[PDB]
Design a protein around this ligand. Sequence first.
Ligand SMILES: O=C(O)Cc1cc(I)c(Oc2ccc(O)c(I)c2)c(I)c1
Ligand SMILES: O=C(O)Cc1cc(I)c(Oc2ccc(O)c(I)c2)c(I)c1
Lengths: 293, 293
Amino acid sequence: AEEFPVPNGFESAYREVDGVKLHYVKGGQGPLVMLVHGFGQTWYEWHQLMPELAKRFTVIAPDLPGLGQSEPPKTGYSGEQVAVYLHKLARQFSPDRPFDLVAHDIGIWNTYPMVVKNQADIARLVYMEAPIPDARIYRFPAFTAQGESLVWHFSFFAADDRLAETLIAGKERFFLEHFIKSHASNTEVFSERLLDLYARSYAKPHSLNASFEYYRALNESVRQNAELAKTRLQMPTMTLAGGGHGGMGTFQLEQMKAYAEDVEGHVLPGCGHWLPEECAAPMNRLVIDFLSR
Amino acid sequence: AEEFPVPNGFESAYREVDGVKLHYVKGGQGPLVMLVHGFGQTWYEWHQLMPELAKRFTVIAPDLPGLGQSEPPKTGYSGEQVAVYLHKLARQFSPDRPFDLVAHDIGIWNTYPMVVKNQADIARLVYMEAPIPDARIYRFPAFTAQGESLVWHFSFFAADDRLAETLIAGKERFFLEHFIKSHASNTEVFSERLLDLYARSYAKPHSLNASFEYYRALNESVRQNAELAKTRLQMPTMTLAGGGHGGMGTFQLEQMKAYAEDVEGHVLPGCGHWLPEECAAPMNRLVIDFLSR
Ligand SMILES: O=C(O)Cc1cc(I)c(Oc2ccc(O)c(I)c2)c(I)c1
Ligand SMILES: O=C(O)Cc1cc(I)c(Oc2ccc(O)c(I)c2)c(I)c1
């Protein structure tokens, strides 16, 4: 059974990595590009970009441990632990060449440590719509003059007592729709069918828990990154962020400047947090052009 | 019927104020002191302080509109709107003399406007454990290096689509235990028996909704207070705050200095948000002594 429809010419498959069965969708020919999704989603958020990229690259889009059809991590959910799985998965398919990495949302948290620790393995890097976990996140406000902030979920999801699983269970579809649309500019792209598919996936009890364990490990990830960041990133990097409601605006590039020697950034007007779906055509174009250099 | 046990020698009664039936518990003789509870609780948080105060004062402890056994407000939930009900209630019992006010948590939000607008009616004032709604609240962090922040619930409760009622309905008892204990230093005072009492009250559907409407009106209260605060409070004031986990610490007094000419503050070590229950002996002593001047 597949949680999401696989594009033509792609295959849904699994690899064991350090005793954890990871799911991915793979297609194309050429140098490897790995696309890593974030919270509330799965490999499927990349399904529009994948066929275009597959004209020039071998494309792999894994499900993060515990999410989609991937088994939970056996080590832990901190960025350094999760990044091992993703790095080793990429290396199974690109053992002899560096590969490209594109990540969205918590896909950034789960890849940054393997990028900085294995720079020779990373040809080009694209990061969109999430802070790298560091002390900057402690400044985001709990509440705004316009009401509900965009970041209060960091605390909701990190809270103990399984607070988030307990309140969201039985209301997974309701909560996800609220979360996705409140972080969107272009809500129309989230059809009832698309929301149904994402909700069914993250509502699997181990996946609902996995979702929040990423946040329960966030402080540990920040502490980890405090040490890792002593080494600057040297590979060509591009950042993307939405400039509309729900988006991160200038933060993405400005943070990345502290991490990378060679970075260019774009802010996409009229687009929120969910760039691959809200603004597929220009996002796809920018990613394809940057990687095709 | 009574949701909470009335102390010996007190009465539970109701008063209709501008078309809204307010519940209160009253006892004692002498000048009037009104005690106003906050979120998650009812008049009952004051039940240990009340008999002591009643030796020197007429004591009234109302349920906030919509909470406990009080009807929802008919105007709205902004501070200025709710303060009218509380001011009129007090003045029914003390029409020719000023009265004392003690308020905790959102009790502050719901009384500040009537204090500033009717300064001659307030002899002495005690505020504990909440910010007065102003722009300072936009600076509190969504997430901290220790985990769950103090005020992330501001956004949860303010969120559209009845997000909070939808998630919390049926899980009120679970949620309230988490909320109260996460904001406490001395968690041991929150027995299952006591939590049962509070949860059964706020689980009434109109009470669960009323609770969150106070937060949905928070930005309105901030706008209201920006005008009101152009006049400083002139009456003797005391602030209390917990110095332990969950407490507001030095913020309480520091903010109050901007609002009051005559203020003394105390931070109680090893106590969190729930001062009357976590640290009954020193809190009661501070309040009784201050009002007895
Ligand atoms: O602190 C700054 O410089 C500016 C800043 C402020 C915030 I609130 C913020 O959080 C967001 C915003 C959008 C979003 O979709 C998500 I998920 C989190 C970020 I990233 C940066
Ligand atoms: O950042 C600052 O200025 C200091 C600050 C930080 C926070 I997070 C905060 O919110 C609280 C604190 C305790 C509490 O019990 C509740 I409910 C809310 C406050 I008030 C002040």
